[PDB]
Amino acid sequence: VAKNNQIPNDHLRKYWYHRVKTFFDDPARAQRRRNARNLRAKKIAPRPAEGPLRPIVRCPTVRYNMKTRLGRGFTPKELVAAGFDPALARFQGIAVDARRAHSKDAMVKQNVERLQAYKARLIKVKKGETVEQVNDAALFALPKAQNEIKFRVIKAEEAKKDLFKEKTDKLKAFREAKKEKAAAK
Amino acid sequence: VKTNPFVSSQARKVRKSYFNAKKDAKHVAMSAPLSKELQEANGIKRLPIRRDDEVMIFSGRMQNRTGKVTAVKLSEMRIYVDTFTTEKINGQAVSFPVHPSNVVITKLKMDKARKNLIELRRLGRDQILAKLGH
Amino acid sequence: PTRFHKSRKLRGQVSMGFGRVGKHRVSPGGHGRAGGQHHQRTWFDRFHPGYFGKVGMRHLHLMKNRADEYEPTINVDKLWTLVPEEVRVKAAAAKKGDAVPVIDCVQNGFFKVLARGELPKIPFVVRAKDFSEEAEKKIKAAGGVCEKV
RNA sequence: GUAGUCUGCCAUACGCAGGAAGACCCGCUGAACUGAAGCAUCUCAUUAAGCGGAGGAAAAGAAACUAACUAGGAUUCCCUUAGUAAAGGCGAUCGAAAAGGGAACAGCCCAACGUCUUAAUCCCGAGGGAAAUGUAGUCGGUUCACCUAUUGCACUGGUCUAAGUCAGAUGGAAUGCUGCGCGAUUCAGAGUAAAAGCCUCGUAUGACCAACCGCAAGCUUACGAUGGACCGGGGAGAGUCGGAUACUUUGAGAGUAGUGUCUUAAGGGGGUGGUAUGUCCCAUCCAAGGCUAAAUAACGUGAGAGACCGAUAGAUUACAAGUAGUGUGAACGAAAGAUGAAAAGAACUCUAAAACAGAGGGUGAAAAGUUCCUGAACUUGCUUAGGGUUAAGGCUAUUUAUAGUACCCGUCUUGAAACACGGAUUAGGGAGUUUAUCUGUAGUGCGAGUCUUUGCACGUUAACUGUAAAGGCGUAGAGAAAGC
RNA sequence: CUUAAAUGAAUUAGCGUUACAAGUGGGCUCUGACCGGUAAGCGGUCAUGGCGAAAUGGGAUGAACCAUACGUCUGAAUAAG
RNA sequence: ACAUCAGUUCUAUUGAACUGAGAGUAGGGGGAUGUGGACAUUUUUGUGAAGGUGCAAUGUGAGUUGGACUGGAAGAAUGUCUAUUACAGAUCCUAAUUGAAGUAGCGAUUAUCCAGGCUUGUAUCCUGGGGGCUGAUGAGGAGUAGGGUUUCUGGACAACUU
RNA sequence: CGAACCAACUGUAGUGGGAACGGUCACUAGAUAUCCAGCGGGGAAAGAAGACCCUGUAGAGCUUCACUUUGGUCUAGUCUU
RNA sequence: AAGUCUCUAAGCAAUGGAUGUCUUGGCUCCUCACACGAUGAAGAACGUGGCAUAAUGUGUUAAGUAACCGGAGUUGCAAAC
Incomplete structure (x- = not known):
């Protein structure tokens, strides 16, 4: 320890120098991944490679209520509303999730319309024939969230309110409730 | 410039493969041009x-x-030849080796395999010069 | 790199810029933070005072997505930065009537609002989770609304 | 007495187990050096060695899970959260998880219980055997919707490829030197008596004709399969969860996990919600049985690339090296590359006892003449030239043997020529480097922003280039905390 | 705000402020002052200087004393002696 | 008189004129030399590259360059990049080699002598004859353990058997 | 025929100062060289990083009225019962 | 006041193997694979070629034999085809 530097905090007391992991694989790893998903999409043909189709889903905690992401799979309720067979819909190229049942009415209306757009232009191969592999990233990918303004009319019941006196005198009402029960007993 | 990854362009690897090739590749490595009398004949x-x-x-x-x-x-x-002899200090002729790529072939003797090789390369050379367009 | 080092010029010099009498050696003090209450205390006392000791209340299972820890803040002087600049120029030319634009703080990741500087006299509506006393006061005085969520 | 069963032991028919390897993987067992400037808790470390066991991957895995929301939804891994919450002689140090972004994405079924099915099941190949101490199968019924065939594993060799051995001089040899032609979807590279786009193999690039073209599993049009709703039902893992106590273990703190001992539930009920305990609400799951690809790991073994080494280097090993050689043994372990383009590897003669050793004479461009390219220094021999009673050497000055001067370097030290230590000679090796987390100065780009990397898309492919969204640090702080 | 009057010792000199970091933390000593000791080239302090890290000349010889502190040369006149 | 490092007066484009100073261990800063490899740019070489040995210049210096002999195939420069990058010492490592030095020394075991044979060459290898030694726990004849061809015949002397 | 120890470079003395016991420094005395065999005065000769003494927040053997424990023995409770 | 001795330099050698130039060997990174064994593995021993000790092939069918795929002498001497 010397000079004006900050306390010496290096987590290097274990024998780290035996347990080293160098990442010179990374660009060769990229090709092992990449050559796999091309050897997929030929074997999967004529079915669409960007699938299977997945629901839009709100993220849980307070600081991601805004955002919406891809889930795991559609509910058996949401399929039957859209017009599908829950068990068979796995093999039509739609992921299914039996567990999720906290999704409220607003996000169901998206995911029903999401499946209807799929079921509108899904078609089935007959017996002998072969059909061209129609890729479409527009359908499978989630629609991006944005709102511009939503400007609205002024109420003229604003100066009636003051929020800070409503906040504080709820607490000061609550404080006197405890101090009366403590004092009286 | 080479596209094929599996062939190597290091000098260490090529010399080692060249000197320790299989028997069939070494016969092909030992080769020479014909004289122009035989070029027009055999093609x-x-x-x-x-x-x-x-x-x-x-x-x-x-x-x-x-x-x-x-x-x-x-x-x-290398190739031993008749005539190509210096004597020792003893009265004894010894045949002297020469590498074929310095040398021109003046006469040739047929074999089923030699005729079967020539009829391939004649038909190959007709295709390639029509492609390039000379 | 290895050319530009001071070590490279100290060839010939026998100690390599480390003394004769002392002799540069691996453990002068002891390892890391050692002797902080004893023989290296002067360093701790002089540069990092308050290092030793325990203070505060233990917090078990702290999460920072809770709305107890997690409050991002924004200030009253701006807000108008969140909206593009074509909007508020139209909002400046308006009667005491209609079409008062909603500056949504909560979409952009700002929960509380805090009055450090000025505004103009444009009407607007702040949607946020919380305010201060003075931030609520300044938004009224500009001529605008304080919505809660 | 004989005729079934039960239990035990022996003999025999048919396939199976062991041993090798062990980098990675799974289960146990388990140190100390070290750090804390001492040392005993702690740390090194739930590491090394030891014991046991798998596969090309293993292990994990389908909620008695997170959460408190505008809700997520098996497992694994990468980025971040985070050097944070926490742990700690609160010392040294140690140290996670949910959410968020990305790679990949697949779900299934025994038990019992349907208070039904005349074992409806399985092995052996006409009939024997296992099995009722339980194998096999969809809970029953009405009624609309709807689906119809593909899916895993397995996949082979060969042929052909452009343009000057141009001319002249030098040379043992031309690929170099001077001058004129020609090829290129081929100027990657090597061989060739010397430096090669055109002397040879190749390289490049499409064309060419043989070999195959099958293994299981499922199909195949309806009371056949699957699903929704409504009616009427059964059940869901016991020395187990849990408890007290002891030990090991963890960030887990009035116990994170495991194990011993004793103790031991309930099933209109039980677990979880990170401070013990009872108690009232709300939310969320249903333990004590099993299987399961992919993303992921790789100091072992087998088979292209390089700003790396160039024979004291690089592996212990460029070579008849795990060899020569040492030790009773476990084990230990070197030195050693280069004739020349081609052996043309030195005939024959003379002196000599002579496969002693030369001398003539020859081979080759040149002896380079056999651990033979180049052949340095130390040491030595011969020849030539000077100095010498001053140990020798150095420096300065000139008419060159004199004058004056000059203690032996390196090192610890207040002080070394020291009777302080290291130093016989010479060559070659031979010591402040790199990583992580930071500090400050200077340079550079953008600037209330900035970083494009985890990864995806490109590629003349580890590069470079393009880009979506998170995330990091910054943008607001004080307080133990509530609240501000 | 402003009413008056000036830059009112010598000699010398630009002054102020910040950042990062090395070595060091065994000293020895002349001349005076001093404590302990019979005294010591002994032990422990003080003030300026010196050596350590300072050549050259002088004290025949010497870290410390005297003159003086140094680029390479050519002269002149000196210091200690 | 000259060199270096500061500074003062000026100067665009790197300079001019002039003034001043001079120790240095531990240690710090500035500019420069050299080595292995890289990317550009430019060349040299069988009319002789690198290397090595002597000599003459040149730079304050680390160095650099010329010509002569030797050698027989590759080297170097300029600007940036990079590092297993500069040695007299470490009782340093490995490899070779001095003086001491033709010196110390050639031990222990009975004792050798003379004439012949074989030879280029014997006191030594063999024969013959003197003189001796061992003197039945014998350098006699034979075996365990151990060694492993040392046994036997023929040929051989580069080395070993002071 | 034919080694090794050892070796900074060396190899005559006296006093002086000097790390206080010089082969080299200053001032003097000596000297022509090169060998042999003896010899033990000197080279503070050689052989060993002093086994004495002291240091180290370095070890090890052994002891006990040091500090911690682990095992053995005894005793209680629970299980086998 | 002697030197074939000793000291220094140059030239030609002896000894020695540095320097320089060469490179069918390493080292590392990435890729693909792991399908050893009672049908006797890994490891050990000894055989066997015309001249073969080690290593490499190979097991009394012993530097190989049979079949299919390559297709003309893969090295010194000798011999055969």
Whole structure:
């Protein structure tokens, strides 16, 4: 320890120098991944490679209520509303999730319309024939969230309110409730 | 520039493969051009050399003699020839090795495999010059 | 790199810029933070005072997505930065009437609002989770609304 | 007495187990050096060695899970959260998880219980055997919707490829030097008596004709399969969860996990919600049985690339090296590359006892003449030239043997020529480097922003280039904390 | 705000402020002052200087004393002696 | 008189004129030399590259360059990049080699002598004859353990058997 | 025929100062060289990083009225019962 | 006041193997694979070629034999085809 530097905090007391992991694989790893998903999409043909189709889903905690992401799979309720067979819909190229049942009415209306757009232009191969592999990233990918303004009319019941006196005198009402029960007993 | 990854362009690897090739590749590596009398006849420039035929070297001590091939050598990588002899200090002729790529082939002797090789390369050379368009 | 080092010029010099009498050696003090209450205390006392000791209340299972820890803040002087600049120029030319634009703080990741500087006299509506006393006061005085969520 | 069963032991028919390897993987067992400037808790470390066991991957895995929301939804891994919450002689140090972004994405079924099915099941190949101490199968019924065939594993060799051995001089040899031609979807590279786009193999690039063209599993049009709703039902893992106590273990703190001992539930009920305990609400799952690809790991073994080494280097090993050689043994372990383009590897004669050793004479461009390219220094021999009673050497000055001067370097030290230590000679090796987390100065780009990397898309492919969204640090702080 | 009057010792000199970091933390000593000791080239302090890290000349010889502190040369006149 | 490092007066484009100073261990800063490899740019070489040995210049210096002999195939420069990058010492490592030095020394075991044979060459290898030694726990004849061809015949002397 | 120890470079003395016991420094005395065999005065000769003494927040053997424990023995409770 | 001795330099050698130039060997990174064994593995021993000790092939069918795929001498001497 010397000079004006900050306390010496290096987590290097274990024998780290035996347990080293160098990442010179990374660009060769990229090709092992990449050559796999091309050897997929030929074997999967004529079915669409960007699938299977997945629901839009709100993220849980307070600081991601805004955002919406891809889930795991559609509910058996949401399929039957859209017009599908829950068990068979796995093999039509739609992921299914039996567990999720906290999704409220607003996000169901998206995911029903999401499946209807799929079921509108899904078609089935007959017996002998072969059909061209129609890729479409527009359908499978989630629609991006944005709102511009939503400007609205002024109420003229604003100066009636003051929020800070409503906040504080709820607490000061609550404080006197405890101090009366403590004092009286 | 090469596109094929599996062939190597390091000098260490190529020399090691060259000197320790299999027997069939070494016979192809030991080869020479024909004289222009035989080029118009058979329709090929380049052929691998056997113990039948004879050969003619420009530039040397043994300058401009014909002579038949007594022995090919694939480990030593050179060709013994009739006529191409210096005597020792003892009265004894010893045949002197020469690398075929210095040498032109003046006469050739047929084999089923040699005729079967020539008819392939004639048909190959007709296709390639039509493609390039000379 | 290895050319530009001071070590490279100290060839010939026998100690390599480390003394004769002392002799540069691996453990002068002891390892890391050692002797902080004893023989290296002067360093701790002088540069990092308050290092030793325990203070505060233990917090078990702290999460920072809770709305107890997690409050991002924004200030009253701006807000108008969140909206593009074509909007508020139209909002400046308006009667005491209609079309008062909603500056949504909560979409952009700002929960509380805090009055450090000025505004103009444009009407607007702040949607946020919380305010201060003075931030609520300044938004009224500009001529605008304080919505809660 | 004989005729079934039960239990035990022996003999025999048919396939199976063991041993090798062990980098990675799974289960146990388990140190100390070290750090804390001492040392005993702690740390090194739930590491090394030891014991046991798998596969090309293993292990994990389908909620008695997170959460408190505008809700997520098996497992694994990468980025971040985070050097944070926490742990700690609160010392040294140690140290996670949910959410968020990305790679990949697949779900299934025994038990019992349907208070039904005349074992409806399985092995052996006409009939024997296992099995009722339980194998096999969809809970029953009405009624609309709807689906119809593909899916895993397995896949082979060969042929052909452009343009000057151009001319002249030098040379043992031309690929170099001077001058004129020609090829290129081929100027990657090597071989060739010397430096090669055109002497040879190749390289490049499409064309060419043989070999195959099958293994299981499922199909195949309806009371056949699957699903929704409504009616009427059964059940869901016991020395187990849990408890007290002891030990090991963890960030887990009035116990994170495991194990011993004793103790031991309930099933209109039980677990979880990170401070013990009872108690009232709300939310969320249903333990004590099993299987399961992919993303992921790789100091072992087998088979292209390089700003790396160039024979004291690089592996212990460029070579008849795990060899020569040492030790009773476990084990230990070197030195050693280069003739020349081609052996043309030195005939024959003379002196001599002579496969002693030369001398003539020859081979080759040149002896380069056999651990033979180049052949340095130390040491030595011969020849030539000077100095010498001053140990020798150095420096300065000139008419060159004199004058004056000059202690032996390196090192610890207040002080070394020291009777302080290291130093016989010479060559070659031979010591402040790199990583992580930071500090400050200077340079550079953008600037209330900035970083494009985890990864995806490109590629003349580890590069470079393009880009979506998170995330990091910054933009607001004080307080133990509530609240501000 | 402003009413008056000036830059009112010598000699010398630009002054102020910040950042990062090395070595060091065994000293010895002349001349005076001093404590302990019979005294010591002994032990422990003080003030300026010196050596350590300072050559050259002088004290025959010497870290410390005297003159003086140094680029390479050519002269002149000196210091200690 | 000259060199270096500061500064003062000026100067665009790197300079001019002039003034001043001079120790240095531990240690710090500035500019420069050299080595292995890289990317550009430019060349040299069988009319002789690198290397090595002597000599003459040149730079304050680390160095650099010329010509002569030797050698027989590759080297170097300029600007940036990079590092297993500069040695007299470490009782340093490995490899070779001095003086001491033709010196110390050639021990222990009975004792050798003379004439012949074989040879280029014997006191030594063999024969013959003197003189001796061992003196039945014998350098006699034979075996365990151990060694492993040392046994036997023929040929051989580069080395070993002071 | 034919080694090794050892070796900074060396190899005559006296006093002087000097790390206080010089082969080299200053001032003097000596000297022509090169060998042999003896010899033990000197080279503070050689052989060993002093086994004495002291240091180290370095070890090890052994002891006990040091500090911690682990095992053995005894005793209680629970299980086998 | 002697030197074939000793000291220094140059030239030609002896000894020695540095320097320089060469490179069918390493080292590392990435890729693909792991399908050893009672049908006797890994490891050990000894055989066997015309001249073969080690290593490499190979097991009294012993530097190989049979079949299919390559297709003309893969090295010194000798011999055969």
